[PDB]
Amino acid sequence: KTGKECSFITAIGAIFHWGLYDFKYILESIPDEWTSRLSIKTTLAGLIKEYCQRFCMRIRKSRV
Amino acid sequence: GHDQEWESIFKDCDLSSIDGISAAYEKFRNVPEFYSKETFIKKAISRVKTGKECSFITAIGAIFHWGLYDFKYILESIPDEWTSRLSIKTTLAGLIKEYCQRFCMRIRKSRVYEIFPFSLASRLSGISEKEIFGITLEAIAESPEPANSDRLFSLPGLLVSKLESNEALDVLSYA
Amino acid sequence: LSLQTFNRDETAAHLHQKFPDASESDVDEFHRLSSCNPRVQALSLSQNLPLNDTLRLLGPNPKTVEDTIGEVLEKSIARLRDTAGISERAQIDTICSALAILRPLIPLSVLSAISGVAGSAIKSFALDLGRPLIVSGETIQFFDEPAETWFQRRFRPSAADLHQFITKLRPLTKDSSYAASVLPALMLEGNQLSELIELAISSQALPETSAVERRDIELQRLQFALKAALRTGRYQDAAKLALKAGGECAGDNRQRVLLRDNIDLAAKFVGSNGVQELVSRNAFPDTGWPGSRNAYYAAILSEYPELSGEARSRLRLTMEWLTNWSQLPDDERSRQNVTDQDRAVMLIACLNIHGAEAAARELRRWRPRKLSFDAGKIVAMQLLAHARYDELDQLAIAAGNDISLVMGIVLEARKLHRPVAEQAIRRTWRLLKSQRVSIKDRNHANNQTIAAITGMVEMALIQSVCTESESIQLLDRYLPKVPPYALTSEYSKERVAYVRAYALQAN
Amino acid sequence: LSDAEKYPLRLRDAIVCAVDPERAPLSYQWLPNRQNRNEELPNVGLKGDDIHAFHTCSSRTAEYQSKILVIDPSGRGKDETGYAVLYSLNGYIYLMEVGGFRGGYDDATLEKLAKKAKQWKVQTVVHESNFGDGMFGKIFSPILLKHHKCALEEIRAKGMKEMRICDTIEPLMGAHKLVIRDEVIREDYQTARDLDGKHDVRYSAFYQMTRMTRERGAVAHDDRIDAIALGIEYLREGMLVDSRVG
Amino acid sequence: TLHRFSSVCAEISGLGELSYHFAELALSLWRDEHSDAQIKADGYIDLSRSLISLDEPEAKEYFNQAIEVTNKLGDENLSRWEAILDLAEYVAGKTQVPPEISYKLARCAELTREYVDRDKHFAWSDT
């Protein structure tokens, strides 16, 4: 529903305690209209940092 | 005209004493007309005896605990003959320093209006203007109050006396 | 095992022994201002003063009966030193030194860290000494100003104390906004000047915080490095710092008025800790009569339930100053203006703390009844913004025969297409039908009577309260028979109201 | 033709009369007609703006309610300092002098202003304040007090000055509440002198009035009409006093 | 008018998305152009107040913009310009000056003439 999107993003990030590979899908699924609102941007900016800190021994840049 | 008003105001008023000046000012206040402080100053200077002028200057500087604006009158009113005597010069230097320390958060240099005549005070006292700005700055550095915006935007006009031109160009390029 | 202080019910059962008819808000104010400590409550109630005076002496800045300040406090601190153990006296002197130098909202953890004293000793010292100190939450405060000034002059620390405080304080600055805000004022005292200069010039780091706190740290660093630079002859850096600092000072001054004028948003987007710290540091400026600040401090605190006991005590302090303004001579009173915005914030504060009826009674004390209309529009706008419909309904019903407030409320409610409680509209329709109303401006323009009457008629029609014959009679009483001027001026405020009114009468 | 909304202000909509300094009629009625039209006063207004007297008025006369002098001090560089003299009675506002002096805070200008405050027996002195200057009142008051004594009061206004002037004068002039002392129309037209003393209509107050528009490029000079606007606004708002009972 | 539409459409069921739309359009009319910091700071407050009943985490961000914008130009000009002139007329007679400094001084004079209201408040002859 309109006006409760950030609650959904925070909940779906929190519930399943996502592994390394699965996080990719959430960013892939968000519609473009969702980008126009600044609360959604700051929520995603908050969510990326936790992933980058939790998996610091496994993140790398690759060609394959 | 109006001479007998003056002859009533200075009736037995010892201008060489501190109290007589205050008594004369209250006699001036008694019949409220023609209020102009400079006139009272000028006349009292016209009535002081020989060899007791410095007592008058110290007294008149002390009695009324002058505000920011009013001080301008006294420097303006002193006769030129009094400049020949060196005790008067050292007394005026002390009285200028008193003012420069009491109002350090409000003294500034301006193009619109001249609140404090730096050149006249410099000539009467013998203190150069480059020392007067230093006297103001060291009193600013000691003061416990924080500064306001108008004080902050007028400090470069005082600090600029210290800098070499090569430094002032850097300050301008920064600004 | 540990034994626990009074809860709310214990304090209520204590208070009703002396005054068996005190209200809930009296229990709230007495429970907050006594730190839940039974000895303090008993000591205060033992005087057999009237109830209002008993609360007033616990409030901010009480009656300064002491003609020569600090006299009894010196004796109290000396007697507290003499009776303590041989280990305690250095700690008492250290606490006295530490309270004289910090900024005014001290958390107990930082005080404990920099002084090395256990927190319970600090709390017991403050409970022993009594006023002017107070402990609430985990915070220490002074509640009276010249007492605070005398204390800060009497017990100013030494060089070794300052060195210890700086050394203890500096590691904490990576996490605490308070430590980062406090440190430069201590470094200026310690004569660690060059470090302060290079702290302000360079891009030294900051803790993670909102903008309102970050501006403060930046400004404090600049303000004290300017003094250090003048004290060490660094004139070029001094000029650059002055140019840099002027804009930040002007921005702070422009920020505080913006927070003052928008209490409804400010109380919501700032946490309760920031709200308490704004009051503690005395951030708002006055608005043209000498006690004005306390009107806004009362408002912003009243948005939070747990601060309610303090809020009343600030509101109580406001009515003193207003009373003084009412007793001035007419020519002096004409120079101290009181605006309708002040009446609106006081109305909001009283509605939050006491209730709708007590809020409504005070608005009838101002004599020209135009003022009720002016305040009512602002109050209706603020309440309709946050969808507080039932509170607005209660205020509408409680107005009684003060019809100007109702006519303002319906005028603002019509613009946003909200209904209004039909009981008050039936009563005020019954009053309108028989007696004159004129919302007369002192200016001979923008007389609001036509708009208010039209809004009343629209509301009465949409709720089917009245007949059409009544409506025709009422509009016929008020519409001019010859055209008025405003129909041919495109910037006259009145034009649209006349067009709407004539169209409605015609149809 | 944009003749109805190019220029909001018209000289047709104000009463011109040689009022008495001590009593004035308590009401007036407005009708421009050949019997009432003036023909001798100089008139810089655009074509069709004809000066007209009142048509009928009451036979009952009384003293004025309040009396203000308004000052607009000179800024940076050389311009004329503006001033105006206004009284009020019921809804009517009376205008009796407007003009200007050229200079700064020298003693001559302030002496002339003090003598002007003496001459009309004014009751309050009001001036505009900006930028935290803080000088003018502190400078002016000890010079004023040796001639006349009354309170000094500051204002500050905000927004577009042009739209503020238009939106202040137009509701007043539309209600036809504005009465002008006769000789003012001559005096301003005589005193509209350049720095060299040459005649120049751009310093006339009524030239500035008749070319006023709600634009930011409206007019290059405003020193007299601005003092008129501030006098009108102060007489409009200053009458209120409240009280509290309980 | 746009703020009123934004407020009213938030309470009606199923019209909520327009509450964002009417907001952003209202931002487009004044965000690009010159005005003083207080007039600009007041606009974000109304944008924030229009959306409180609908999406509070969005309403917070315009309040943050309102707080942030208060640093910029405003009434404190004509005080800064006097300090700039006090520096410039000290340095002027003594040394050669690079051309780009002289150009930027006049560019900033053209900028600072735009913000004042009345022409008589700007220092023409001294500049």
What is the distance, to the nearest Å, from the Cα of residue C119 to the centroid of all Cα atoms in its chain?
Answer: 30
Q: Which tokens sit at D219?
A: 């007019």
> Are D146 and B69 in contact (CB < 8 Å)?
no
Give the bridge partners for E75, in sequence order: none
Amino acid at C3: L
Plot region of C35 (φ>0 → left; ψ -120 to 50 → alpha; else → beta): left
Contact in structure between C32 and C310 (CB atoms under 8 Å) = yes
Residue E62 · residue E44 · CB < 8 Å: yes
Phi then psi dihedrals of residue C287, to 5 deg:
-130, 45
DSSP state of C285: P
Q: In this structure, what DSSP letter does residue D15 have?
A: E
Q: How many residues does chain D have?
A: 246
Q: How far is the CA of C273 from the CAs of C41, C280, D111, in angstroms?
A: 26, 10, 58
Query: Quick check: C371 and D246 CB within 8 A?
Result: no
* Tokens (6 digits) for D151: 């309170």
Can you name the residues that pair with D29 across neighbouring β-strands?
D56
The DSSP H or E segment spanning A28 is helix A23-29
What contacts B3, CB < 8 A, 6 or more positions away?
none
Secondary structure (3-state) at D92: strand
**CA separation, residue B33 to residues B5, B30, C282, C324, D152 (Å):** 10, 9, 46, 36, 20
CA distance C145 to C152: 11
What whole-number distance in Å separates Cα of residue E59 and Cα of residue E41?
A: 15
To test the contact with chain E by mutation, choose from B113, B172, B173 the residue with the greatest count of E C-beta atoms within 10 A, namely B172
Q: CA-based Rg of chain D, rounded to a whole angstrom? A: 18
CA distance D4 to D168: 18
Distance CA D34, CA D43 (A): 17
CA distances from D43 to B140, C29, D169, D188 (A): 60, 73, 20, 11
Angle between helices E2-11 and E17-28 (to 10 degrees): 170
- The DSSP 8-state label assigned to residue D199 in this structure reads B
* Type and span of the H or E element at A23: helix A23-29
Chain A residue with CA closest to E54: the answer is A3
CA proximity to B42, closest of B22, B17, B60 = B60
Binding-site residues of D for Mg(2+), in ranges, read 72, 128, 226
Q: How far apart are CA E15 and CA A2, in angstroms?
A: 9
Q: In terms of Cα–Cα distance, which of C419, C340, C421, C400 is closest to C373?
A: C340
CB count within 10 Å of CB C214 equals: 15
Nearest CB to E83 within list B156, B165, B166:
B156
Residue A3 region by backbone torsions, left for phi larger than 0, else alpha for psi between -120 and 50, else beta: left
Closest CA to C255 of E42, B11, D6: E42
CA dihedral of D180, D183, D186, D192, whole degrees rounded to 10? -80
Would you call the peptide bond into E99 cis, given omega within 30 degrees of 0 as the criterion? Answer: no
Contacts 24+ apart (CB under 8 A), B2-8: B2/B34, B5/B31, B6/B43
CB C373 within 8 A of CB C456: no
CA distance C470 to C451: 18
Reported for B158-161, long-range contacts at CB under 8 A and 24+ positions apart, including other chains, are: B158/B108, B158/B109, B158/B133, B159/C235, B159/C238, B159/C239, B159/C242, B160/C239, B160/E86, B160/E87, B160/E90, B161/B129, B161/B130, B161/B133
Give the type of residue at D40: E
Quickly list DSSP for D109-164.
HHHHHHHHHHHTT-SEEEEE--TT---HHHHHHHHHTTT---EEEEE---S-HHHH
Instruction: Report d(CA C187, CA C205) in Å as an integer.
Output: 17
Q: Which chains touch E (3 or more CB pairs under 8 A)?
A: A, B, C, D
| Structure tokens, B124 | 């009467």
Structure tokens at C362: 């005070």
Q: What tokens appear for A42 in the block? A: 């700051």
Q: For residues C495 and C400, what is the distance between their CA atoms, to the nearest angstrom?
A: 32
Nearest chain C Cα distance for residue E125, angstroms: 24
Q: What share of chain A is helix, strand, coil (3-state, %, to 5)?
A: 60, 0, 40
Q: Does any CB of chain E come closer than 8 Å to the CB of residue A7?
A: no
DSSP H stretches of helix in C61-107: 71-82, 88-99
The phi-psi region of residue C107 (left if phi > 0; otherwise alpha if psi is between -120 and 50; otherwise beta) is: beta
C204/chain E closest Cα distance in angstroms: 21
Q: Which residues contact D77 (CB under 8 A, 6 or more apart)?
A: E120, E123, E124, E125
Q: What are phi and psi of C182, to 5 degrees?
A: -85, -35
Give the number of other Cβ atoms within 10 Å of residue C163's Cβ.
14
Distance between CA atoms of E92 and D35, rounded to whole angstroms?
Answer: 68
With contact defined as 3+ CB pairs under 8 Å, the chains touching D are B, C, E
The answer to whether the beta carbons of residues B15 and B44 sit under 8 Å apart is yes
DSSP D244: B
Q: In whole angstroms, what is the distance from residue C310 CA to residue C389 CA?
A: 27
* Cα gap B42→B79, rounded to integer Å: 9
Q: Point out which residues pair with D61 in neighbouring strands.
A: D25
Q: DSSP label at B146?
A: P
Enumerate residues 6+ apart whose C-beta is below 8 A from C306: C272
Give yes or no for a contact between C196 and C225, defined as CB atoms under 8 angstroms apart.
yes
Positions at the binding site of D? 72, 128, 226
D198 three-class SS? coil
- Residues contacting residue B114 through CB under 8 Å, at least 6 positions apart: none
Exposure string for C371-405, b = 16+ CB within 10 A, e = fewer = bbbbbbbbbbbbbbbeeeeeebbbbbbbbbebbbb
CA distances from D89 to C277, C344, C446 (A): 52, 33, 20
**C413 with C384: CB under 8 angstroms?**
yes
Cβ atoms within 10 Å, residue D101: 16
Positions of E strands within C54-177 = 106-107, 133-136, 139-142
Radius of gyration (Cα) for chain B, nearest Å?
20
3-state DSSP assignment of residue C103:
coil
With contact defined as beta carbons under 8 Å apart, do C454 and C500 qualify?
yes
Give dist(CA B141, CA C231) in Å, integer.
6
How many C-beta neighbours within 10 Å does residue D26 have? 14
* Parallel, antiparallel or unpaired: strands D124-128 and D92-102: unpaired
D77, D130, D160 ranked by CB distance to E124: nearest:
D77
User: Does C254 reach chain B within 8 Å, measured CB to CB?
Assistant: no
Q: How many helices (H) and strands (E) does chain C have?
A: 28, 3
Q: Are strands D80-89 and D66-72 parallel, antiparallel or unpaired?
A: antiparallel
Q: CA Rg, chain A, in Å?
A: 13
CA angle C40, C45, C50 (to 5 degrees): 140
3-state class of C387 per DSSP? coil
Residue D108, chain B, CB below 8 Å: the answer is no
Helix (H) or strand (E) holding C435: none
**Cα–Cα dist C135/C130, whole Å:** 10
The interaxial angle of helices C211-231 and E56-68, nearest 10 deg, is 20
- Residue among E64, E76, E83 minimizing CB distance to C211: E64
- For residue D165, the tally of other CB atoms under 10 A from its CB is 26
Hey, what long-range contacts does D197-201 have (CB within 8 A, 24 or more apart)?
A: D201/D44
Helix (H, G, I), strand (E, B) or coil at C142: strand
Residue D34 tokens, joined:
């050949």
Q: Which residue type, as a one-letter code, is found at position C126?
A: A
- The 3-state DSSP class for residue B74 equals helix
Residue that is written with structure tokens 């007495």 in the block: C30
Cβ separation C387–E53 shorter than 8 A: yes
Phi then psi for C187, rounded to 5 degrees?
Answer: -65, -30
User: Is the CB of residue D73 less than 8 Å from the CB of residue D81?
Assistant: yes
Residues in CB range of A48: below 8 A, 6 or more apart: none
Place of tokens 């040459």: D198
Which residues are CB-contacts of D41 (< 8 A; sequence separation ≥ 6)? D16, D51, D182, D185, D186
Question: Exposed, middle or buried: residue D20 (CB in 10 Å: 0-12, 13-18, 19+)?
Answer: exposed
**E63 and C255: CB-CB below 8 Å?**
no
Residue D82 DSSP SS3: strand
CA distances from B144 to A14, B140, B141, C185, C227 (A): 53, 9, 9, 11, 10
Closest-CA distance, D146 to chain B, in angstroms, reads 5
End-to-end CA distance of chain B, in Å?
58
The pair of structure tokens assigned to B161 is: 């006396």
Resolution, in Å, please? 3.4
Q: Note the residue count of chain B.
A: 175
CA distance C454 to C448: 10
DSSP labels, C189-258: HHT-HHHHHHHHHTT----S--HHHHHHHHHHHHHHHHHHHHHTT-HHHHHHHHHHHHHHHHHHHHHHHH
**Separation between Cα atoms, residue C336 and residue D7, nearest integer Å:** 39
Distance CA C77, CA C92 (A): 9
Q: Which helix (H) or strand (E) holds C33?
A: none
With CB atoms and an 8 Å threshold, state whether D171 touches C492: yes
In whole angstroms, how far apart are CA C45 and each of A54, C5, C19, C72, C447?
Answer: 58, 18, 10, 21, 55
